[model samples]
Target: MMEKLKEIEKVTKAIKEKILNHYGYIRVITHHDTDGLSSGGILAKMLMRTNKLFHLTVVEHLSKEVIEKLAKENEVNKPLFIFADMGSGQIEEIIKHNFNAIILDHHPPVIKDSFINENIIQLNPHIFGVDGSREITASGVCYLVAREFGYYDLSVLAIVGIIGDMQYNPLLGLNKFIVNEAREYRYVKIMNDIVYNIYDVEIYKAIAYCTKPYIPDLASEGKAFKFLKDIGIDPNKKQLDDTDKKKLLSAIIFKYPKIENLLIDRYLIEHKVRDAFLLSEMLNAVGRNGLFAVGIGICLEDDECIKIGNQILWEYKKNLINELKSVKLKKLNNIYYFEGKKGMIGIIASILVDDKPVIGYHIEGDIAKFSARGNRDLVNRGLNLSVAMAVAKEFGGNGGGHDVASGAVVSKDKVQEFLKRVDEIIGEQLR
Candidate 1:
């Protein structure tokens, strides 16, 4: 462990020095997810402090089209390209383009051994025997490097990133270390009170509108209002008392065992920045809505930006719920397949997930996106979404992600064939 930390320090030190020495613009390539948003936000703060100009591009995946475009842009500016939450799997492609890049990622690489490019420096945990899954996220990686550059105040972003990546509770490995350090920073606090993080909304309304763990009667305003009122609560009150919260929590847990996930460790930037889970959702809401700049606004604490973000958070959730209802389900031999809007494909697939693997896809223009989510039983039985997604490449698409949640993208013409192949692979792996 000590050896790994030293190695981390060594690489971070070098990256720090290079970032400090850099002049002109730096191009940031990040994925458009919670983890990705936090990763970019953390690094953006660091680069901004150094007086370095940076531009961020958020893509669904590191597709050939996207990578080629970034490479082309690099030709014009020759800026230092920083890829967070992505670029590890596409390192070989990136190297071929002769772009100056630093990949601060936590995903499976596209190759067997370490990738080396004079212009590329990778700080992926996979190379160092550190498990990226549930151990560290892109936000954590950026946090480490930013700290090396003395951006300790940016630790809130790191906590948000880890939680956004859904790597807590066990908090094993490097994550545990991060939690300890975050507490020392006096900004992050672990508490169990948050039902949802939109403070501007009436508390009852926030509970009624949450989509992640969509409840039937409780998720509706009429029902939720009655439920809270029955529990000795006042809708006009700003907060729920502990007894009221405990009763509500019990009711929620009876239906969803994973209700504990709602209880999170917070990055208490201030009164406004207190809820860790809400901060992550706000960033996600902005990112998925194609408002990447707006997400950065929430991260940097722009009052209007956060207000706009908070407003959009509900719309995204409402859209997801409405979209899930429209999902057209199809049954395969071993997976339940469905189709929905591009942005809501994976998220909606999450709730539709069953005891087996559930697959979701969306076709927009040339890209047909796929997301595979494994139920608890399948994951316990050794399902690996990342492997299944990587197999998608053979079918003329590119894919990679975590064990339980993974995604892929194939050309529209190849969608049917890709689905059949990956479905077979999913069954083969589970069986």
Candidate 2:
């Protein structure tokens, strides 16, 4: 891992040199998700510290239309562009626009016949034989680059992004290095505790709102209250005693036997949010709600933004729980599937990826957006949603991401065929 880190460092240095050499303003473009927001936030602060003039834009995806529009808008400035969490997959479009840019990304880059543009300084883990999915997230990659500029404390945001991307257990590769740095800087403290995000909320509400380790029926308010009462605990209790906590944990584990980690390391960040998992969710809420400024402001530790972000998080959670209760999952031969809101599909698919690889999609205009998720066991069994999703190109769409989780977009008319083909390809993968 250190060797890979060393290789990555060399690219970071080159990117730094590009930043230093450029005399004009810089443009920073990033995805609109927790990881992307963290990456953008880190870069935004890093550049500010260096007294560099830059503008940050958080976007959903780098479609050709969006890229072209950006190119047209910035044709005169000719500023240095930095793409975080995205742009590796759209290298050709970037190059065609003749934009001088550095890409800090973790997604699989577009590679063909083992050839790529050497001039482009896009640092991606897959290009260096590292597992971006489980080992490190895009924010982890951004932290590695940000540290080169003496911003190692920014690693705390990377940890938030890691949890945001759902890579929170037994941190490995570059992720472990980022977390350790965060610990060393006293920005994060880790302790063993339940993985559920139950802070500031009542016990029953916490159990009812828990989606990460989605309990079968406990996610519903009525079910959670009844379960607590049946277990001899008052659902209305403001706080749980040690005995009450232990009993509640045991009952939850007994009901949901597949709890992967009953007692896992809980990260506490040095911020008002404190809880790293909850902080990540806040960032996600702001990002999903198209409040990129608020999301980045929270990362920048702005108290006002954090308050707004917290409000957004509750609203997002409320809608998610409502969706979880009403969303009808349709099963294909090799996968479970559903249609949902564009931003919520990823979270929905992630929560439902226990029995089989799940694909959640939603229609937007003429295109159907997809978000697919699989468990570690499925990934170990040769499942790679990135490959499965890239099959979208056959139907005039594009997609690529990690092995366990990925996304794609196809024409509305071809959504059925696209999903069927993904099912077939996934079937072959597990076979």
Candidate 3:
């Protein structure tokens, strides 16, 4: 770990030196998700403080077409392009143009290359023998770069990025140094599971709306407050009382028995049983649905963003409930395919097959993406999704994420083959 940390520091310092030397007009292309937005925010803040001209754009996903447009737009000024949370897979194309590119990313690299050019720099955890799936997130890596550039003050943005990536949870990988530094800087605070304050009617409405599949009665502003009142939750004071919290916990246990033991042991409060997963799903829904502006708004600490985030939360909840109640199963070879609420698929897949492996795939256009999630029992029995995703990727696809929860994307034509491959891989790994 110490050696890896030293390597990270060395690489970061080298990148910082390069940036300092070319600290003129700069362009940052970052993902539109919370983690990506937070990374861009931190980098922008750092560059601004250093008196460098900076332009930032949030992108849904990067493809060759988008890159061409960006390159063309920058032809006049020829700004140094710094890609945060993206550019790993596009390294070949990005390097071909001889643009001064610095990629600060945590995604698995599609291709491995040692030296590109003095004009291009790729800073990925995978290059340093770190697992992109669990080791660190994009913002966490960017935070390291910020530290190297002497911009440690923006650690709060780093923490926000971590939260955006769902790395705050115990199961996900976190960089301890960044975590400790953020806490020490007062940018992050570790608190007990949040007690949903029912007195704050707005927060209650927000929480109710955010749960998956179950749209709150007050989905719109006109009925939002009344809906909270109908649920016996106060909108103004949203914190749940002891009795309400207990009731919520019981409800969660009844709904999700597989995780009941862990929830009880860790939280000692039932209300948190569903809160963590619900928040993650809500944030992810914002990402999957081209709601980058909404995601950015929430991260910006704006009042309007807060309201929208709350509203989205209710929408997410409603959608999840609908998925849970209405989703039908279709067996595709060894895997199951279903049309359900996108956010809840991961957990639902895990619940459906407690002992055997489960794979969930979401289709969007010519691409079919698979998210593989396994339970603690599966992991203890040696069912690792990382290896499974790797196998799926071998078949003209891209797949990599955490050990317990991972995702992969393949061409629509290869979906059937990919599923068969994934099942075989899981079987081999566990065996």
Candidate 4:
């Protein structure tokens, strides 16, 4: 890890030098998830502080067409491309463009020497023997680069990306350093309490929209109000006292025996959204719902974004619940498979991962989008979804991500065959 950190510092220095020296326009491409948006946001803030002229674009994946378009669109200025959250898995496509680029990513890279060039500076945790899946996130990587420029205040946004990527529950590996730095700088506060979106809203509305431990019965306003009254709490109150918070948690736990850790140490940032979890949800809502402007705006602390992003969050949660409830999964030998909305499948697959890995896919025209998920236990048993999904290449598709979760895209006709192979690969992993 020491050697890896040194190498990372070296590459980040080169990236910083490039940004400082280059007079051309800068183009920032990043994933649309909480981690991706957070990473892009951090870089945007850093670039703005340095008075660099840049444009940021949020994307779901780095397809060949996307790269081709980028190559064609910016032929004159020869912009420096900074790819956040993605660009590791599709290095071949990115290299094909031969764009002067800096990839700040954590996903497993397609290893090769020929694709490498002086023009592209690629930084990923996998290349340094760090666990990108659990230890750190793309946001953390970007924050490291930003920190090189003394933008420590961006650590708050880094914390947002950490929690957004679901990487800070335990704050493993490099994430510990980032979180500790944020704490030391007074950019964040941690409290062991209910990690839910319950504050600043009526108790009934919070209960009605609670997703961490989604209560099927309490999903309705009337039922949530009644449940609160029955549990001896004021549903009309916007704020809950400590005693009330405990009572609400206890009642929910009692009803949902499987729900765990309703009260835990939650990350609180100094941003407009104090609760990092809630902020991450807002980021996810905008990302998944095609409200990229809102997500990025929230990241930039835009007032209009704050107003519109919060409004989108409720509908996003409601739509997600509806989708989750309507999903019909078919069981394979070693996994569960389902077709779902591409944007929502990752969350759904994660929620359903327990006895076996879950695979959620959706069809768009002739292509199928896949999102696979497994638990820590599965990973402990040698599960690597990254390798499992990478097999999509055999079917004229592409995929690779973390061991616990991954995404792939293939032709619609090849979805079943891909799942069969994925199941077999996962079975061999567990065996």
Candidate 5:
């Protein structure tokens, strides 16, 4: 671990030098989720410290079209564009623009033989032996770059992003380096087997309301505050009392059990544990369902978007309650299968299969995406999703992710066969 940390430090230094030499205005485009927000926040703070001007944009996801528009918008007033959680996959479109682009992300980049332009800098764990799928998250990558550039003050925010991304879960290859670094902060406390700081309550409420598949209404801020108060958790103030902090942490722990062990054992509260599938659904709905601007607005804390998010929260709660109470389990081709609100499938996959190995598939158009999650015991047994996805890719699919949670996209026509192959591969790997 120390060796890996040393290497990360060296790489970070090199990247920082590059950024300093190219110092100018920056556009920090980042994901809106907790991790994404944290990533952008950390970077923004660092840039501010360096007296660099920047514009922050929170996005749901990335695509070539979005990149093209952003590039065009900044073509004349060309600022160094730094994409934190995304942009690796859209390298071509990004490179097409005449602006400098520095992408720091943990997601798999579009690997190619050479770069179309020298202005594009792709900093990703995949370029190294480290597995971005599980080893480190976008925020972790951002932290490396930040630390290299003398932005150590942003480490706490990076930790928040790490928690938001769910990268700290031990079942998905422990990020011990980030964990250790965070521990050095006295105010950043971990208790009852989860990461607890002065900010857990507010962060928890924010996550509960902003989670994908659900949005918190602005009016509900009062209600959310009440909810926190009812639970003896304060939302507006830092928690100084240990007893109060523990109660708040326990409430968060109960909200998601699949990652409970990771939180307890490793002392980190990963937002990914809250309900990634639901978050993905909410995000997807906003993206594919014509609510793009609305979703982005809420993420950026726009007043109107906040109201919409709050309204969506009620609907999310209603749907989750119904699904959890009455959804029947079915077996299909040796794989447990069920139909859910297209939005709930992702979260359901993680929560329902917390005790065993399970894979959830959702069909969108001619392609099908599978979300694979494993229990701690199963992960320990060597059931890796990357390997399973590699098997799927052999059958004309593309997939990758971490050990505990992973995903893949395949031809819809071969969905059944893909499931069968996944089951076989996972069983074999575990054995």
Candidate 6:
């Protein structure tokens, strides 16, 4: 309703009318992250509500090749292309192709330049001084567009996306406004907790296997159980009272004071959407492992995918720990970096986001794909992974995303050179 969103909201209504008025096919190209999956799922469900079905595909990143493929699809299938969680930054590239497209994203966008994208409708928070990274997410943006088309019940999916992007409890800004909308529609109920990962597993295993803000020793089953016992928490208690919960939470916070206040609200949905955090993790694993159809099916209300997705989460978390334990990470002044499969670096660096800026790179084909993460401390100290990666372009690579998290890709042999330049830029910016 505000002036800034007047245009975005207008586009949503227009797009909805178009979807209903025409008989063209649709395809959703979403990024392969928790946020991406959540957004894609929302759009998929929205399409269903309109008596329309869509094809869903996930990607690691939007290489030019991927864009070309989509362009070719426009040449063949002529589906209306909807890009979720990504495509804003590459708007210039997206416009170059011949496709009827719309980008619903939350990342920094290509702003300085513009083309007459008659077929493109961009709904990015960055356009209105909104910090899309923390204040809202791609799912939130997609939710707005979907709501215009009477897909109001999909609000729970939006909350799941908010959790996926690590937005703090109760939401904020445009995100807050959407929560009110969701509450009005009775799509979500909120709760609170520290250990948000109430994975289908038992407490001992769940507590030990925390992936987000991954604890070092506590990540092990024995150590997590031992810590609970040391804190006088009964292993047999299926649920901890607030008193014991506080004690357990205090113990974990003591080891890592940096995340002491990084709390988030839980959405206890009345429907199958209860426990938004767990849903976020499930979708996250599906995206990380290239299980796009699995993720799409989950969002479309397939119960069997629940068990399948949970298994993926278990393997994803366990494997991340295993990889961390095996890797020999090297530190460059304030940067701590490691190498592994390109797909895993983002997940690996995410666990250490609060400690410092982390850089994870691995050889993928002829390129050294990079993922970087930072946190409040790093951000306050002038660290911006997006900016670092933007500068990486000078080193024969390309990278850019949010301030806390970003990614890049460079010639395989230029990894070290790219890293050195990033470190220098970070040091100067922090200094």
The number of the candidate with the highest TM-score is 6
C-alpha displacement of 283 in model 5, angstroms?
13
Candidate 1, 137-199: lDDT as tens digits: 889998888888667677788878877787865687877777677778776666655655435
Over 291-340, each residue of candidate 5 has an lDDT whose tens digit, in order, gives 54455453343676645644564465445545654546565433465545
lDDT of 6 by residue, 1-431 (tens): 37766766666777776678657788889887778887888888788778877777888788888998778778767888888888888887877885677788788888532223566777777776788867888889999888887777787888878887878453688788777787887887665655533454556677666766676777788887888889888755655667877777787777767554535555765446367778888898887787888887777668877768888988988877787677677888768888977556877787766556888888868878899988776788777889888976787768898788899988988888888888888888788
In model 3, how large is the Cα lDDT of residue 303? Answer: 68
Q: lDDT per model, in order?
A: 0.77, 0.83, 0.64, 0.83, 0.60, 0.76
Off by over 4 Å in 6: 1-5, 70-77, 89-97, 109-120, 127-131, 259-262, 331-333, 353-355, 363-371, 384-431
Residue clash pairs of candidate 6? 169-265
Query: For residues 1-431, could you state the per-residue lDDT of candidate 4 as single tens digits?
Result: 55667767887888788788888889999988899888988998999888897888988878888888999966787889999988888887877778888888888778522126878888788877788888899999999899889998888888888877777767798998888888999888887766443356887887777766666677778888998998899898887779888787788766666555456577778888877788888898888778886788898889899888888898887777777778898999999999988657888888767569999998989999999998877899899999999999999999999888899999999988999999899899999
Worst 10 residues of 5 by lDDT: 210-219
The residue-by-residue lDDT of candidate 2 on 301-416, one tens digit each, is: 89999999988888888778888888899989999999998767887888887768999999989988999999888999999999999999999999989898899989999988
Q: Which consecutive 10 residues in model 6 have the weakest lDDT in total?
A: 111-120
> How many collisions per candidate?
0, 0, 44, 0, 15, 1
Question: CA lDDT of 250 in candidate 3?
Answer: 60
- Provide the global lDDT of candidate 4 against the true structure: 0.83
Lowest lDDT block of 10, candidate 1: 263-272
Estimate the overall C-alpha local distance difference test score of candidate 5. 0.60
Residue 50: error of model 3 in Å? 2.0
For model 5, the stretches where C-alpha displacement exceeds 4 angstroms are: 1-24, 109-118, 148-151, 171-174, 194-321, 332-334, 354-356, 362-370, 379-431
